[PDB]
Design a protein around this ligand. Structure first.
Ligand SMILES: CCCCCCCCCCCCCCCC(=O)O
Ligand SMILES: CCCCCCCCCCCCCCCC(=O)O
Ligand SMILES: [Fe+3]
Ligand SMILES: [Fe+3]
Ligand SMILES: [Fe+3]
Ligand SMILES: [Fe+3]
Lengths: 285, 285
């Protein structure tokens, strides 16, 4: 359907809009290119590993590669719905958001190629709980926005994507990668990439927070909805976390070999800490 | 609806795909930031002008500011349709495409602000023919892709957006800006921006060409459709061009003052040259 006018013809960009400022920061801090990362040492490290240690690292890479690919496809409806509501600055920022995820898909896929597992199907490490979040609830909530851009729909989409998938799982994954391999001295290329992903991620979660907080602000009954959507998802969050944990407890040889005392109980409570801390970033008032 | 799998989990990115290569080029050559452009001299130039010369430049800025804003909102359905067809590399590239246009909206709006016309409504320089292309046919063709991603729909969308709006009007506009103001010594900031826009634009038109050529390749009856959609639009193309030309012939004082012999007849045949040359870039075979 038709445009009825153009903001930057009638007026200008709202330069003071937070999403315009968050767009500006993204351009300044989003210059990194996965294609400049040197994975040659990563390749050597992965070959150096035994078959059992090789396994140790794949689940996490599995969950991330599929995750980045899901959010790259699935952020589009949000940009569409906000564009329809005339939120130009939100859209400007969202272009950086979508390119960020394209680079993230790119980064993990380069790593797989480089270390020689690109031809290996890693879908096997996606369990039921993971499929429920990523194969199902995420795309349902996002695509919903094509036909229903109510406050409710928008809140639930930001919650699933920005607060749960990014704000809870992705954050915990970044932490898990560092806890394990930055210590081991392994996969310097991957960790370079993970640090850049983690930076990008800050902007993604701030968008989620702003989006949710401005809808809560108009009517604090929506706060309750927010908490409810968080808690609806927790079981699959932890159910994936437990699954990865038990895969870990059954394949200790990467831990044995690299003198790591992998405190799965500390990863567990980091996830929890993440979940509760995302809740705290939304004010009821 | 659900994801049924993920390419970068089952396999990797197709690294040899042209849209993956075009994505790579975009990252290398898309670093420019409108916010680094110095418009201080532009501000002085615009104030230096008489009221009549001030007018001379606004139509063109009008058509561009609305144009950039239209394509920023209106490229989204293309990314959506290709994402649904599983064309991952196309999507990766399209993230650069969408960010490019966000920067283009940003560039012209900064210029208006800087020279002091941000508060002026420039919609008055959009005539009937322009509204038909930009207010109507462009969004119709793009949004169509949400419910109809047939070869026909896709060809017609690439034709309206990439071959006509970018490939014919935008290209001619870049040329018109240089012909007039690069000579006059005016608006160095704006022209800096225009040069960057022109570079970005090369990738946008190549995407259009690749998209159209791969559908023609499967069935050369679609070539005819391509030419037809080009010719359907020509009247509004030229009808805008004539309108801008007559606005120009009635406000000569920028020409008189800056020793410009503005060959509107040469701009005219540059537009035509553009139109015919876009046709030539699609092979029937
Ligand atoms: C053993 C402790 C478990 C740690 C939790 C790991 C969760 C893996 C992360 C996979 C999902 C990543 C989603 C990406 C989101 C984005 O890129 O914006
Ligand atoms: C006097 C000679 C006329 C020259 C033709 C000028 C046409 C003005 C351009 C306005 C449309 C620009 C559309 C932008 C497309 C994009 O940014 O991808
Ligand atoms: Fe990501
Ligand atoms: Fe993210
Ligand atoms: Fe543009
Ligand atoms: Fe363009």
């Amino acid at each position: 359907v038709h445009h009825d006018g153009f903001q930057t013809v009638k007026a200008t960009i709202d330069w003071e809009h937070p999403m315009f400022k968050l767009y500006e920061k993204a351009k300044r801090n989003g210059k990194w290119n996965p294609a400049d990362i040197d994975f040659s040492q990563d390749q050597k490290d992965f070959a150096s590993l035994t078959s059992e240690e090789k396994i140790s690292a794949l689940p996490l890479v599995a969950g991330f590669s599929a995750g980045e690919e899901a959010v790259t496809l699935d952020i589009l409806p949000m940009a569409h719905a906000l564009a329809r509501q005339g939120r130009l600055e939100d859209v400007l920022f969202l272009t950086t958001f979508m390119h960020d995820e394209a680079k993230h898909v790119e980064m993990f896929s380069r790593w797989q190629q480089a270390v020689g597992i690109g031809q290996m199907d890693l879908s096997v490490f996606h369990n039921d709980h993971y499929k429920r979040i990523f194969y199902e609830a995420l795309p349902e909530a996002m695509n919903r926005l094509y036909a229903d851009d109510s406050p409710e729909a928008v809140i639930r989409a930001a919650t699933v994507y920005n607060m749960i998938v990014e704000g809870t799982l992705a954050e915990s994954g970044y932490y898990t990668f560092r806890q394990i391999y930055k210590k081991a001295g392994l996969f310097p290329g991957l960790l370079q990439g993970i640090d850049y992903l983690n930076m990008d991620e800050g902007r993604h979660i701030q968008f989620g927070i702003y989006t949710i907080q401005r809808i809560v602000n108009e009517d604090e009954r929506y706060y309750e909805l927010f908490i409810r959507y968080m808690d609806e998802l927790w079981p699959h969050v932890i159910g994936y976390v437990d699954y990865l944990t038990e895969l870990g407890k059954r394949q200790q040889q990467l831990a044995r070999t690299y003198a790591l005392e992998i405190d799965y109980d500390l990863l567990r409570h980091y996830v929890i800490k993440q979940f509760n801390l995302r809740k705290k970033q939304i004010s009821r008032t």
